[PDB]
Design an enzyme around this catalytic site. Structure first.
Site, PDB file in Angstrom:
ATOM      1  N   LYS A   1      -0.842  -1.825  -7.510  1.00  0.00           N
ATOM      2  CA  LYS A   1      -0.020  -0.637  -7.310  1.00  0.00           C
ATOM      3  C   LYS A   1       1.055  -0.486  -8.380  1.00  0.00           C
ATOM      4  O   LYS A   1       1.318   0.630  -8.838  1.00  0.00           O
ATOM      5  CB  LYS A   1       0.614  -0.673  -5.920  1.00  0.00           C
ATOM      6  CG  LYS A   1      -0.397  -0.596  -4.790  1.00  0.00           C
ATOM      7  CD  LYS A   1       0.269  -0.744  -3.435  1.00  0.00           C
ATOM      8  CE  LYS A   1      -0.703  -0.433  -2.310  1.00  0.00           C
ATOM      9  NZ  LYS A   1      -1.289   0.928  -2.449  1.00  0.00           N
TER      10      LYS A   1
ATOM     11  N   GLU B   1      10.358   1.867  -2.198  1.00  0.00           N
ATOM     12  CA  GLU B   1      10.320   3.241  -2.676  1.00  0.00           C
ATOM     13  C   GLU B   1      11.087   4.142  -1.719  1.00  0.00           C
ATOM     14  O   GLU B   1      11.541   3.719  -0.651  1.00  0.00           O
ATOM     15  CB  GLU B   1       8.877   3.739  -2.837  1.00  0.00           C
ATOM     16  CG  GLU B   1       8.086   3.015  -3.914  1.00  0.00           C
ATOM     17  CD  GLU B   1       8.580   3.332  -5.311  1.00  0.00           C
ATOM     18  OE1 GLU B   1       8.959   4.495  -5.560  1.00  0.00           O
ATOM     19  OE2 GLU B   1       8.588   2.417  -6.162  1.00  0.00           O
TER      20      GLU B   1
ATOM     21  N   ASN C   1      -2.059   4.459  10.019  1.00  0.00           N
ATOM     22  CA  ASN C   1      -2.219   4.820   8.610  1.00  0.00           C
ATOM     23  C   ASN C   1      -3.690   4.910   8.213  1.00  0.00           C
ATOM     24  O   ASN C   1      -4.090   4.469   7.134  1.00  0.00           O
ATOM     25  CB  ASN C   1      -1.472   3.840   7.704  1.00  0.00           C
ATOM     26  CG  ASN C   1      -0.019   3.678   8.099  1.00  0.00           C
ATOM     27  OD1 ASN C   1       0.727   4.652   8.175  1.00  0.00           O
ATOM     28  ND2 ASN C   1       0.388   2.441   8.355  1.00  0.00           N
TER      29      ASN C   1
ATOM     30  N   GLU D   1      -4.490  10.668  -4.623  1.00  0.00           N
ATOM     31  CA  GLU D   1      -3.790  11.036  -3.400  1.00  0.00           C
ATOM     32  C   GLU D   1      -2.336  11.356  -3.713  1.00  0.00           C
ATOM     33  O   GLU D   1      -1.656  10.576  -4.388  1.00  0.00           O
ATOM     34  CB  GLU D   1      -3.881   9.916  -2.364  1.00  0.00           C
ATOM     35  CG  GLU D   1      -5.294   9.623  -1.894  1.00  0.00           C
ATOM     36  CD  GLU D   1      -5.417   8.267  -1.232  1.00  0.00           C
ATOM     37  OE1 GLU D   1      -4.487   7.448  -1.379  1.00  0.00           O
ATOM     38  OE2 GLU D   1      -6.440   8.020  -0.563  1.00  0.00           O
TER      39      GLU D   1
ATOM     40  N   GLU E   1      -1.392   6.180  -5.200  1.00  0.00           N
ATOM     41  CA  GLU E   1      -2.664   5.462  -5.160  1.00  0.00           C
ATOM     42  C   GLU E   1      -3.823   6.293  -5.702  1.00  0.00           C
ATOM     43  O   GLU E   1      -3.831   7.523  -5.587  1.00  0.00           O
ATOM     44  CB  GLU E   1      -2.965   4.993  -3.731  1.00  0.00           C
ATOM     45  CG  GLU E   1      -4.175   4.082  -3.602  1.00  0.00           C
ATOM     46  CD  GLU E   1      -4.572   3.833  -2.160  1.00  0.00           C
ATOM     47  OE1 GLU E   1      -5.213   4.719  -1.557  1.00  0.00           O
ATOM     48  OE2 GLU E   1      -4.248   2.751  -1.633  1.00  0.00           O
TER      49      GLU E   1
ATOM     50  N   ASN F   1      -8.078   5.945  -5.505  1.00  0.00           N
ATOM     51  CA  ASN F   1      -9.252   5.215  -5.040  1.00  0.00           C
ATOM     52  C   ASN F   1     -10.339   5.307  -6.103  1.00  0.00           C
ATOM     53  O   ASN F   1     -10.879   6.388  -6.360  1.00  0.00           O
ATOM     54  CB  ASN F   1      -9.737   5.770  -3.706  1.00  0.00           C
ATOM     55  CG  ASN F   1      -8.811   5.425  -2.561  1.00  0.00           C
ATOM     56  OD1 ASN F   1      -8.407   6.295  -1.790  1.00  0.00           O
ATOM     57  ND2 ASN F   1      -8.463   4.149  -2.447  1.00  0.00           N
TER      58      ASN F   1
ATOM     59  N   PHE G   1      -3.402   4.836  20.544  1.00  0.00           N
ATOM     60  CA  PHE G   1      -4.131   5.876  19.816  1.00  0.00           C
ATOM     61  C   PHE G   1      -5.458   5.360  19.274  1.00  0.00           C
ATOM     62  O   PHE G   1      -5.905   5.768  18.200  1.00  0.00           O
ATOM     63  CB  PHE G   1      -3.282   6.460  18.686  1.00  0.00           C
ATOM     64  CG  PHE G   1      -2.244   7.430  19.152  1.00  0.00           C
ATOM     65  CD1 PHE G   1      -2.547   8.374  20.116  1.00  0.00           C
ATOM     66  CD2 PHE G   1      -0.962   7.392  18.638  1.00  0.00           C
ATOM     67  CE1 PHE G   1      -1.592   9.267  20.552  1.00  0.00           C
ATOM     68  CE2 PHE G   1      -0.002   8.282  19.070  1.00  0.00           C
ATOM     69  CZ  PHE G   1      -0.317   9.220  20.029  1.00  0.00           C
TER      70      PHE G   1
HETATM   71  N1  ATP Z   1       6.162   5.886   0.300  1.00  0.00           N
HETATM   72  C1  ATP Z   1       5.599   6.517   1.335  1.00  0.00           C
HETATM   73  N2  ATP Z   1       6.253   7.564   1.884  1.00  0.00           N
HETATM   74  C2  ATP Z   1       5.697   8.198   2.919  1.00  0.00           C
HETATM   75  N3  ATP Z   1       4.536   7.948   3.528  1.00  0.00           N
HETATM   76  C3  ATP Z   1       3.911   6.909   2.965  1.00  0.00           C
HETATM   77  C4  ATP Z   1       4.358   6.155   1.893  1.00  0.00           C
HETATM   78  N4  ATP Z   1       3.448   5.157   1.581  1.00  0.00           N
HETATM   79  C5  ATP Z   1       2.488   5.328   2.458  1.00  0.00           C
HETATM   80  N5  ATP Z   1       2.701   6.368   3.323  1.00  0.00           N
HETATM   81  C6  ATP Z   1       1.825   6.808   4.403  1.00  0.00           C
HETATM   82  O1  ATP Z   1       0.865   5.791   4.641  1.00  0.00           O
HETATM   83  C7  ATP Z   1      -0.455   6.256   4.283  1.00  0.00           C
HETATM   84  C8  ATP Z   1      -1.200   5.156   3.572  1.00  0.00           C
HETATM   85  O2  ATP Z   1      -1.240   5.453   2.161  1.00  0.00           O
HETATM   86  P1  ATP Z   1      -1.964   4.489   1.142  1.00  0.00           P
HETATM   87  O3  ATP Z   1      -2.986   5.211   0.359  1.00  0.00           O
HETATM   88  O4  ATP Z   1      -0.898   3.767   0.321  1.00  0.00           O
HETATM   89  O5  ATP Z   1      -2.624   3.408   2.097  1.00  0.00           O
HETATM   90  P2  ATP Z   1      -3.732   2.272   1.971  1.00  0.00           P
HETATM   91  O6  ATP Z   1      -3.850   1.474   3.204  1.00  0.00           O
HETATM   92  O7  ATP Z   1      -3.428   1.480   0.702  1.00  0.00           O
HETATM   93  O8  ATP Z   1      -5.032   3.128   1.691  1.00  0.00           O
HETATM   94  P3  ATP Z   1      -6.554   2.927   1.273  1.00  0.00           P
HETATM   95  O9  ATP Z   1      -7.339   2.379   2.415  1.00  0.00           O
HETATM   96  O10 ATP Z   1      -7.012   4.316   0.818  1.00  0.00           O
HETATM   97  O11 ATP Z   1      -6.497   1.994   0.059  1.00  0.00           O
HETATM   98  C9  ATP Z   1      -0.228   7.522   3.464  1.00  0.00           C
HETATM   99  O12 ATP Z   1      -1.323   8.421   3.600  1.00  0.00           O
HETATM  100  C10 ATP Z   1       1.046   8.089   4.090  1.00  0.00           C
HETATM  101  O13 ATP Z   1       0.767   8.804   5.288  1.00  0.00           O
HETATM  102 MG    MG Z   2      -4.999   4.776   0.517  1.00  0.00          MG
END
Ligand code: ATP
Ligand code: MG
Ligand code: BTN
Lengths: 248, 673, 222
Positions: free
Chosen positions: B122, B206, B241, B281, B294, B296, B354
């Site tokens: 990241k 962040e 999430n 995204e 991120e 993908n 949920f």
């Molecule tokens: N800095 C942030 N501010 C607000 N919401 C956030 C933030 N980081 C993550 N989120 C929320 O959490 C979700 C997860 O995002 P992210 O793509 O980082 O997750 P992930 O588990 O790494 O995903 P993936 O399975 O696609 O790799 C986002 O869609 C958003 O709803």
């Molecule tokens: Mg993600």
């Protein structure tokens, strides 16, 4: 020169002697008779007529089937002798028994079966189960039509122990007869208990607590004498009234 | 779909589930031999049967079946496969897999490795994006080592704080911090949990965007430097999430901002030299400001929905790019055609957090393929097994239409006409989400499920008209069953004198209320009197089909009769929600008042063994609280393996049953509170 | 409920390895009309399942083994539970459907001392005496004389079928082919066609009449 006559004589002598002099002698040190001796003791002298004596699987096929007379009344008998050879209630053995029951039910005479599984391979082909099923079907069909009597004169094991249970009366011989579905070794393997064959399926067990056998006799001769005496009571078929004898 | 163009002859799909089925389908539709890998359990799955040939790769667990690097390599070796397709997850973003595949002449269908380790982490992805002149969330670059550093960063990056574990993913290691004490304790606990979860032990702090919209851009690139952006996607409805309901066109966006986001995504892709299909995204706030979050570097799970508007087969494009052909579409060629909405049908109980994963075997499974504008992507067939080893997702349901309203109506109809019996699914939650007023209006954020259902999911709160319709339908169904019970064949010895009852007066118990119903039959038409209200129910009254279509006062409805007992109990799936009703005759209802209530809850804090045996395997660990209907242990007895389930919801005090310990009937297995 | 409805759920219901168990009630529910089944003695002798159901609207009696409970082995209680139900169904012209997964009889000294022979004979008699149409389906296992117990072909079983996982042998020939070549099973059917097949058989055998010798009554091993 024709070899048919000598072949027939050899076949008859092999059927009568069975597995040889050594096998009958070994049977004798165990205090038990053979199938033909039991038939001779049970039936009237000079009244036994044997059927399918030349049918093979070795002549005889470890079962002697036929018809005879007790005190002048007709009866059908089969006697098992697996110690000589065979060791399988699968092939012509079951067919001979089924045919003798078929004749008995056609004529309308009782069936007496001297059961002695003895040394029989319980690991034979699937024909054994089919023969057992056919015999069971014939016992169920003949139930209530003609009397059926079973005399266990040796160790009977496996699925064959259901045919005596389907008959009307069951008798045993002490110290030389057993009835059980599963052997003591398999019982120890599964249930983990030390049990001997005599106390697992002996005559005393099945006559005092199991409630399967009806009476127990001292030895083969006594058992056969009591079998004749008991057979004198019953009618030959459900179409006949209760027998009436001379009274004093 | 022109077979004249030369393409790879053998492709091996190193994946399982619906993605493998989709890849096999699109490979067959262009004339390519397919090879599917599988484990011992998935020896009769759909994708194994769709493929031309298959090879077992190992045992049930995915760590030894779908992640067994060598096993897949020799699997390719025997079948001389020319290409490999990883789908998503598993080995889709593994650098060692890409290198090992590149060792041989077989080509990996996916992005180049360099992009994979560029976007895998990241911090480096954010640094490259900042170098790629695209908007990023405000924050501090680098890895924070101490909680004091975290609070110092929070001093200037604003009061809201978002802590995120580096790398990883899947909605893990992401937390919110408000206060300085919250900042430090969250940082400490995330640092502690990083080793357990991922082991990277790196954290990022962040600025947390309030009420964000998770918009997504699909990008397609070839090896000739041509990059295209295919419209957008909105992925807002999420629990834990994880996306649940997605829409292809974003109702929030307009043409100008969509173009800006597409151009930014294409520029970012060019900065990494992406040569496959990927997703970027963004978190768009209320003020139409998008910040990158991120990328993908693989096929997206929700990819089919954007295939509906664009009309492009993404997997075909990835295959063609891997072959080396240039892109056959330009930026002007891409255009939006209608609206498309899709939902993820999981095997989970929506009434607990949920969604809580469930297990079981599907006794009945039917898809609404005959409905208009419905596409189902499922790797499931009747008789399939939902085990604990894999993602419990059942299907993806896609509906497209001319506009959003048509798509939503078709989605509701498809959800109503979709049969799953054997496990517990989340169809009720999906229907409630798609019919919610806020969702229809278009005001949705990433906290939609949280604020719409604060306490939790409770079901469909049905109004007076809907309650009357449900009661009328249930009463009519009960009367129909009673009438069918009287239809015998002619006996010719004792003729049957059918009763001439005209009005059935019934007491119907729903929730904690009792209603008086008067039902009359006029052939195929039932007149129902519910507390004064008059309703008219007409249907074909087929009592054996899983789906029943009725017309109440002209309004068309589809209901399912899940359960039915002679005692009056009945379970009706209506409007996506399962309701329990108790229907009795008036005489029976009056006589029921004298039946004393029998207490049967008891305690059951001790789980006596039902059958004697010896425990050989233990599925759970002592101290792990479990709910009902969950695996406990495996007992061997007489060459038979027996598995039981937990008795009470109470916390597992101690798993007394353990391997090597004989447990006879009537002995404690698992201690519960 | 159409009589030709397929049941693809039964294709993988039987696990490959014989050491695992499954629920026969699932098979029964899948096969019968509307998945409705009135079970008799549901909490007693749970290693055998007996009950009433309907096929094509006609009442049928159902007997089956339960591999979940005691590996489906037959004992005194299960034998007596099954025998009387079979006798009642035969006495009132109700056809019988059997699902066979029996590995044998339960061994031990308690079974012998309780008279397992008599009650096993009760079950044999109940199946052999019946003159109503009877259809037997072998799912996985049939070992020894136990295979003779549950209406083998030789007990006037009208039609017998075997699933591809069925395995008939004396002792624990690991495939049903020895049974097929000797006519022990009429055919090896796919699990998904089961219901359909059964319905067709029940349409044919509705006019079955057999002839047996006259008697006041027979002698059950009661
Ligand atoms: N800095 C942030 N501010 C607000 N919401 C956030 C933030 N980081 C993550 N989120 C929320 O959490 C979700 C997860 O995002 P992210 O793509 O980082 O997750 P992930 O588990 O790494 O995903 P993936 O399975 O696609 O790799 C986002 O869609 C958003 O709803
Ligand atoms: Mg993600
Ligand atoms: C291991 O303990 C040996 C198992 C043998 C039992 C199996 S199952 C039931 C059948 N009856 C019998 O005697 N053997 C067979």
């Amino acid at each position: 020169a024709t070899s048919v006559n000598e072949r027939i004589e050899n076949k008859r002598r092999t059927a009568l002697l069975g597995g040889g002099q050594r096998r009958i002698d070994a049977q004798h040190k165990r205090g038990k008779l053979t199938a033909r001796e039991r038939i001779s003791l049970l039936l009237d002298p000079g009244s036994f007529v044997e059927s399918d004596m030349f049918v093979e699987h070795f002549p005889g096929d470890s079962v002697v089937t036929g018809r005879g007379r007790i005190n002048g009344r007709l009866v059908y008998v089969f006697s098992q002798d697996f110690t000589v050879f065979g060791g399988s209630l699968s092939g012509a053995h079951a067919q001979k028994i089924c045919k003798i029951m078929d004749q008995a039910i056609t004529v309308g005479a009782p069936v007496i079966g001297l059961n002695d599984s003895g040394g029989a391979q319980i690991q034979e082909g699937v024909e054994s189960l089919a023969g057992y099923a056919d015999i069971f079907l014939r016992n169920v069909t003949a139930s209530g039509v003609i009397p059926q009597i079973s005399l266990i004169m040796g160790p009977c094991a496996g699925g064959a122990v259901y045919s005596p249970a389907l008959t009307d009366f069951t008798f045993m011989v002490k110290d030389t007869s057993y009835l059980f579905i599963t052997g003591p070794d398999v019982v120890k393997s599964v249930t983990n208990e030390d049990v001997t064959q005599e106390e697992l399926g002996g005559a005393k067990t099945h006559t005092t607590m199991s409630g399967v056998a009806h009476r127990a006799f001292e030895n083969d001769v006594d058992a056969l004498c009591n079998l004749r005496d008991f057979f004198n009571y019953l009618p030959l078929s459900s179409q006949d009234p209760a027998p009436v004898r001379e009274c004093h | 779909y022109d077979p004249n163009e030369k393409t790879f002859d053998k492709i091996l799909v190193a994946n399982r589930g619906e993605i493998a089925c989709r890849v096999i389908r699109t490979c067959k539709k262009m004339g390519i031999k397919t090879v599917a890998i599988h484990s011992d359990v998935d020896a009769s799955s759909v994708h194994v049967k769709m493929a031309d040939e298959a090879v077992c790769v190992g045992p049930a667990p995915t760590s030894k079946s779908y992640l067994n690097m060598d096993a897949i390599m020799e699997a390719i070796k025997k079948t001389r496969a020319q290409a490999v397709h990883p789908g998503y997850g598993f080995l889709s973003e593994n650098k060692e897999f890409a290198r090992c595949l590149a060792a041989e002449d077989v080509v990996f269908i996916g992005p180049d490795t360099h992009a994979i380790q560029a976007m895998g982490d990241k911090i480096e992805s954010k640094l490259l994006a900042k170098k790629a002149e695209v908007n990023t969330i405000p924050g501090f670059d680098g890895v924070v080592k101490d909680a004091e550093e975290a609070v110092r960063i929070a001093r200037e990056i604003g009061y809201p704080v978002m802590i995120k574990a580096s790398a990883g993913g899947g909605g893990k290691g992401m937390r919110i911090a408000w206060d300085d004490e919250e900042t430090r304790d969250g940082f400490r606990l995330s640092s502690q949990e990083a080793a357990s979860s991922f082991g990277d032990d790196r954290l990022l702090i962040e600025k947390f965007i309030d009420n964000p919209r998770h918009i997504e851009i699909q990008v397609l690139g070839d090896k000739h430097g041509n990059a295209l952006w295919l419209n957008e996607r909105e992925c807002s409805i999420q629990r834990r999430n994880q996306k649940v309901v997605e829409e292809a066109p974003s109702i929030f966006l307009d043409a100008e901002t969509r173009r800006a986001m597409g151009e930014q995504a294409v520029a970012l892709a060019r900065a990494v030299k992406y040569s496959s299909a990927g997703t970027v995204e963004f978190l768009v706030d209320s003020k139409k400001n998008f910040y990158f979050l991120e990328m993908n570097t693989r096929l997206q799970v929700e990819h089919p929905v954007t295939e509906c508007i664009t009309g492009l087969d993404l997997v075909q494009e990835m295959i063609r790019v891997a072959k080396g052909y240039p892109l056959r579409h330009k930026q002007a060629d891409i255009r939006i055609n209608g609206w498309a909405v899709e939902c993820r049908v999981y095997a989970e109980d929506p009434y607990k957090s949920f969604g809580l994963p469930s297990i079981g075997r599907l006794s009945q499974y039917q898809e609404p393929l005959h409905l208009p504008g419905v596409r189902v992507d499922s790797g499931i067939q009747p008789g399939s097994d939902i085990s604990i080893y894999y993602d419990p997702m059942i299907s993806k349901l896609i509906t497209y239409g001319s506009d959003r309203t048509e798509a939503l109506k078709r989605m509701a109809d498809a959800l109503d006409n979709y049969v799953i019996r054997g496990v517990t699914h989340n169809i009720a939650l999906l229907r409630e989400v798609i019919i919610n007023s806020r969702f229809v209006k278009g005001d949705i954020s990433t906290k939609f499920l949280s604020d719409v259902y604060p306490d939790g999911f409770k079901g469909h709160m049905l109004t007076k008209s809907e309650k009357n319709q449900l009661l009328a339908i249930a009463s009519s169904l009960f009367v129909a069953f009673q009438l069918r019970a009287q239809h015998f064949q002619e006996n010719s010895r004792m003729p049957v004198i059918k009763p001439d009852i005209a009005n059935w007066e019934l007491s119907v118990k729903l929730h904690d209320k009792v209603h008086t119903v008067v039902a009359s039959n006029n052939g195929s038409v039932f007149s129902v009197e519910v507390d004064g209200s008059k309703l008219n129910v007409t249907s074909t009254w087929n009592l054996a089909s899983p789906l029943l279509s009725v017309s109440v006062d002209g309004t068309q409805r589809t209901v399912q009769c899940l359960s039915r007992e002679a005692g009056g109990n009945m379970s009706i799936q209506f409007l996506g929600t399962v309701y329990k009703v108790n229907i009795l005759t008036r005489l029976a209802a009056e006589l029921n008042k004298f039946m004393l209530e029998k207490v049967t809850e008891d305690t059951s804090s001790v789980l006596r063994s039902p059958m004697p045996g010896v425990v050989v395997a233990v599925s759970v660990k002592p101290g792990d609280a479990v709910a009902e209907g969950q695996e406990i242990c495996v007992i061997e007895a007489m060459k038979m393996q027996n598995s039981m389930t937990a008795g009470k919801t109470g916390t597992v005090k101690s798993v007394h049953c353990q391997a090597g310990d004989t447990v006879g009937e009537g002995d404690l297995l698992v201690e519960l509170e | 409920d159409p009589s030709d409805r397929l049941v693809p759920e039964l294709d993988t219901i039987v696990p490959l390895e014989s050491t695992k168990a499954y629920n026969m009630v699932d098979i029964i529910h899948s096969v019968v009309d509307e998945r409705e089944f009135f079970e008799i003695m549901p909490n007693y002798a749970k290693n055998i399942i007996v009950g009433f159901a309907r096929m094509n609207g006609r009442t049928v009696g159902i007997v089956g083994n339960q591999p979940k409970v005691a590996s489906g082995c037959l004992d005194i209680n299960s034998s007596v539970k099954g025998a009387r139900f079979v006798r009642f169904c035969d006495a009132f012209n109700i056809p019988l459907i059997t699902f066979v997964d029996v590995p044998g009889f339960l061994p031990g000294t308690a079974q012998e001392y309780g008279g397992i022979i008599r009650h096993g004979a009760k079950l044999l008699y109940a199946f052999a005496e019946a003159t109503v149409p009877k259809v037997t389906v072998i799912t996985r296992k049939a070992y020894g004389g136990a295979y003779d117990v549950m209406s083998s072909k030789h007990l006037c079983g009208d039609t017998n079928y075997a699933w591809p996982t069925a395995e008939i042998a004396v002792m624990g020939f690991a495939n049903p082919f020895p049974a097929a070549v000797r006519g022990f099973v009429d055919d090896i059917i796919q699990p998904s066609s089961t219901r359909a097949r059964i319905c067709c058989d029940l349409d044919v055998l509705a006019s079955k009449k057999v002839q047996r010798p006259w008697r006041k009554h027979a002698n059950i091993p009661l």
